[PDB]
């Protein structure tokens, strides 16, 4: 036991030295001649009404027109954002729903929560009705996130310190990813869809290879729980939001932290993170009831989106890059442009 | 046009359904049940009831005087609680059960209550405090095998208040113990001195019948305080 612990300490020291032998320059030094983006101002176009209680998640479709939302009163609504017409309103079986997703082919949606179950809903039915088609069971803790890869494979993460890859047609887990110590809070998929990353409420993040099922790299640097994570557009970086009031930019090839976004005034944690189409803006949602817009290459705040009444819990940006949707605990969605 | 009319008709049907659903959602009362394994909260659930493997939550429904209560219990989770406890920031009340006749794990209950009271997202929610298993407490005090002062030294000099009105038939030692234990919790309750939310304590046994009425009355008082605060009168 003691020898194994000593070997672990030696390996950690060697890894630390290998990382420290590479920081020949900082991101600020390389980017000291970049012209700032100036002030950014955005206005609400549409306000979408109809939920009865607070909202936990949303997701944009691939057509950049239809979106899905999930509220804690037990409903899942599909909206058209150009005319604010409700296309669908599906009632759930368990009302403590925490996540939602939208299939890239536009045929299915999914949801889950404290019931330890992932439910799949089929939209394109000849009878014109939405009905449950699959319930995936086998996790021993609440569900945090889920993301389709295609019409047949789905990857989820639970509050039992595990992630899993499921075959919907058969109904059995095909691989399980283990190694985290705390509850897994968020995951994000790569553009090529052959890797993902995960942040899991113990102040660490991991990079997972889908096919093989093992862990490639582990990233540390925060000092409390991690709440959100997402990929940079080219698939070679990712941003992390935490509960110590700090966002951080991490790289995969240099194997260490690149940048910290924080201010001496903020004393509240970040609940959502998302990028922009060219990656020049990083948008964040806070417990202060308002969202912040940061320049991602010079670490200077550049805008505020400040129209909500309660905690902001979800944030999304379309695939063409025209609008930004925010959802909060007062049961209202808003679209900015 | 010729297609948009159907879309608006669809949206109108959906809105009608949503209104009919809001009508019934705004009328039920939601309660969250909390406790430990050595308590008897399952007995409370069973007493109020007649009135899938790996399941993460259970629901129990009842009604009193044509008012409908939904009580939620947590099933198969892990030890930690600082993440799924935030989903319950809008319930009417939290029902907290404590086993009061062990003397060894009572500090754990105090610490749990003190951590719930001060959480940022649970500062408006009231608590109904049940102190279960009182006959065992009476027998244990009358036996004399274990002494309370071995865990709370300040019990060595606590005198029952003169203005207190005891229940008939009590041996004064039992009343001393009961009053001391209840005071240990009300002291944490009022140390904030805010007025947003209140703690209502009771003493209950293993065979009992009036617990549903107690919950009903305390919920009535809670609703009254909300109604006063809503009209800007306070």
């Amino acid at each position: 036991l003691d020898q194994l612990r000593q070997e672990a300490e030696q390996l950690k020291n060697q890894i630390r030295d290998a990382r420290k032998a590479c920081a020949d320059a900082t991101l600020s030094q390389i980017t000291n001649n970049i012209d700032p983006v100036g002030r950014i101002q955005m206005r609400t176009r549409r306000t979408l009404r109809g939920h009865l209680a607070k909202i936990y998640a949303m997701h944009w479709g691939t057509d950049s027109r239809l979106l899905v939302s999930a509220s804690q009163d037990g409903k899942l609504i599909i909206w058209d954002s150009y005319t604010t017409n409700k296309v669908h309103a599906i009632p759930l079986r368990s009302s403590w729903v925490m996540t939602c997703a939208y299939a890239p082919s536009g045929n299915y949606v999914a949801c889950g929560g404290l019931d330890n179950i992932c439910s799949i809903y089929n939209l394109k039915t000849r009878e014109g009705n939405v009905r449950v088609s699959r319930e995936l069971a086998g996790h021993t803790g609440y569900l945090s996130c889920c993301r389709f890869l295609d019409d047949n494979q789905i990857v989820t993460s639970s509050g039992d310190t595990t992630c899993a890859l499921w075959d919907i047609e058969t109904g059995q887990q095909t691989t399980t990813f283990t190694g985290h110590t705390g509850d897994v809070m968020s995951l994000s998929l790569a553009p090529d869809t052959r890797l993902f990353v995960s942040g899991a409420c113990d102040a660490s993040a991991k990079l997972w290879d889908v096919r093989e099922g093992m862990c490639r790299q582990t990233f540390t640097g925060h000092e409390s729980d991690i709440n959100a994570i997402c990929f940079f557009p080219n698939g070679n970086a990712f941003a992390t939001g935490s509960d110590d009031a700090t966002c951080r930019l991490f790289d995969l090839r240099a194997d260490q932290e690149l940048m910290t976004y924080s201010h001496d005034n903020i004393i509240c944690g970040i609940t959502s993170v998302s990028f922009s189409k060219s990656g020049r803006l990083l948008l964040a949602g806070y417990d202060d009831f308002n969202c912040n817009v940061w320049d991602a290459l010079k670490a200077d705040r550049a805008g505020v989106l400040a129209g909500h009444d309660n905690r902001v819990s979800c944030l999304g940006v379309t695939d063409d890059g025209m609008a930004v949707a925010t959802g909060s605990w007062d049961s209202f969605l808003k679209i900015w442009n | 046009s010729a297609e948009d009319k159907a879309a608006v008709e669809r949206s109108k049907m959906i809105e009608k359904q949503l209104q009919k659903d809001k009508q019934v959602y705004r009328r039920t009362l939601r309660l969250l049940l909390l406790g430990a394994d050595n308590s008897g909260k399952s007995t409370i659930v069973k007493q109020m009831r007649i009135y899938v493997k790996t399941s993460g939550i259970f629901e129990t429904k009842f009604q009193v005087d044509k008012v409908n209560f939904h009580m939620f219990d947590v099933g198969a989770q892990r030890d930690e609680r600082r993440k799924w406890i935030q989903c319950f920031n809008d319930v009417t009340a939290i029902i907290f059960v404590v086993d009061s006749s062990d003397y060894n794990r009572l500090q754990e209950a105090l610490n749990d209550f003190k951590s719930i009271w001060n959480n940022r997202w649970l500062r408006t929610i009231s608590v109904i405090l049940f102190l279960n298993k009182q006959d065992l407490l009476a027998e244990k005090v009358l036996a004399g095998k274990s002494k309370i002062e071995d865990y709370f030294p300040e019990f060595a000099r606590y005198t029952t208040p003169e203005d207190a009105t005891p229940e008939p038939g009590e041996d004064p030692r039992v009343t001393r113990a009961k009053y001391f234990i209840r005071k240990e919790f009300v002291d944490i309750s009022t140390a904030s001195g805010d007025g947003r939310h209140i703690c209502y304590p009771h003493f209950t046994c293993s065979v009992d019948t009036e617990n549903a009425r107690r919950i009903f009355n305390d919920c009535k008082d809670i609703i009254l305080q909300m109604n006063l605060r809503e009209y800007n009168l306070v």
Partner: nanobody
Amino acid sequence: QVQLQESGGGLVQPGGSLRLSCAASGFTFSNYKMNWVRQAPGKGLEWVSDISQSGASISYTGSVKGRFTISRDNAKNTLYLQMNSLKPEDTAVYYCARCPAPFTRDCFDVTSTTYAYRGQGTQVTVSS
């Protein structure tokens, strides 16, 4: 990389005294509330004492009142416990614990399921 390392402990004859010192790294020491917990042979984890962000609020359990004291050096990043007049039932393993979040006045840090921000403990034995 949060790290909490303990030092002190050992064998003590009954009625003795000693000192436990814990050193912390990987976070801003002054924003967090701190605790001392212990595990006794053949039992679960137990809470012993706690101190707040400055030292103006201290709390103990009923079994160690008048015997153990706690202290906090924010400049030297260190948490101290002083033990006087030990008993044979004070033999256990001792861990120092940190709150999950800053600027907050509550805790959820007694669990067994590998609480993340906790140390490896030291052994304190009292017998002769």
